[PDB]
Amino acid sequence: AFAHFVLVHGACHGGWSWHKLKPLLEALGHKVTALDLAASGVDPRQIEELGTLDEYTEPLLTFLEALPPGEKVILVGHSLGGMNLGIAADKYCEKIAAAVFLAAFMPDTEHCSSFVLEQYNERTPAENWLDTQFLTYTKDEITSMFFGPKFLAHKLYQLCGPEDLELASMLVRPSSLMPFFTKEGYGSIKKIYIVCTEDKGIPEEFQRWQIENYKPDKVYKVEGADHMAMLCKTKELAEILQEVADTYNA
Ligand SMILES: [Mg+2]
Ligand SMILES: [Mg+2]
């Protein structure tokens, strides 16, 4: 039927990356919330004030906490957004109909919370970051990420239009990758993975690896999708999300 989709962006991005998908879900009758996480999009915070992934997720937690009784949402997380999903699902699991991991980090419950990030780090040669800028800052020593135009063009948006890449160049902002996701909370939610097959930021092989590691309830494959499937495969993506809405409810 009709769901409430809560869309959670990835590193260096913001609510704006869902600007093509949201109207599509809304024309399907759904309610759609596309948050800015902390120090993302036009959030007024700067990355230097964020100490943890939990603090980065604050707007998501705040929004879920405000949800009235009976209201349940389908979380949709992109890239690093998948970790925001795990954080949110472990605090407000009673409010989550399902979580969708769009080419995202899917943590598990048997390994430590950062396992998929550590493993992603270990499989990723530093050359792959291209012109991405890594700096350090202090709060209370934290490494910041800032994607450069080459990385955006060559590893994230390579199958997107020039207006998509230019938009990201105009909006991306510094981010950061910064103990256990519980079986009772996060572990209990239905999870859906959307594989993006031409992804060069999180390669399909890593995406398949995470599914192997912690199998979700449904796996969709988006052929021809780079990492920003919501911009190049928006229509197909909305059709998967409708299938999800129809499956996970009453
Ligand atoms: Mg925004
Ligand atoms: Mg392009």
Author numbering: 2 to 141, 144 to 181, 189 to 260
Sentences copied from the publication:
Hydroxynitrile lyase from Hevea brasiliensis (HbHNL) and the esterase SABP2 from Nicotiana tabacum share the α/β-hydrolase fold, a Ser–His–Asp catalytic triad and 44% sequence identity, yet catalyze different reactions. To investigate how regions beyond the active site influence catalytic efficiency and active-site geometry, we engineered HbHNL variants with increasing numbers of substitutions to match SABP2. Variant HNL16 has all amino acids within 6.5 Å of the active site identical to SABP2, HNL40 those within 10 Å and HNL71 those within 14 Å. HNL16 exhibited poor esterase activity, whereas both HNL40 and HNL71 showed efficient esterase catalysis, demonstrating that residues beyond the immediate active site are critical for functional conversion.
Variant HNL71 contains 31 additional substitutions beyond those in HNL40, giving a total of 71, which corresponds to removing approximately one half (49%) of the differences between the proteins. These 31 additional substitutions increase the sequence identity to SABP2 to 71% for HNL71 and expand the region of identical protein sequence with SABP2 to 14 Å from salicylic acid bound in the active site of SABP2. The 31 additional substitutions in HNL71 further increase the kcat value fourfold to 310 min−1, making HNL71 a 2.4-fold better esterase than SABP2. Although the sequence of HNL71 is closer to that of HbHNL (72% sequence identity) by ten amino acids than to SABP2 (68% sequence identity), it shows no significant hydroxynitrile lyase activity and instead is a 2.4-fold better esterase than SABP2. The χ1 angles at histidine, serine and OX2 are within 7° of those in SABP2. Thus, the 71 changes introduced to create HNL71 create nearly, but not completely, identical catalytic atom positions. In HNL71, the data also lacked sufficient electron density to define nine residues in two surface regions: a two-residue segment Gly142-Lys143 in the cap domain and a seven-residue segment Met182-Glu183-Ile184-Leu185-Ala186-Lys187-Arg188 in the catalytic domain. During refinement of HNL71, the Fo − Fc (red/green) electron-density map revealed a notable density adjacent to the sulfur of Cys163 in both chains A and B. Placing an O atom into this density decreased the Rwork and Rfree values. This addition of an O atom suggests that Cys163 has been oxidized to a sulfenic acid in HNL71. The oxidation seen in HNL71 may be due to oxidative conditions encountered by the HNL71 crystal.
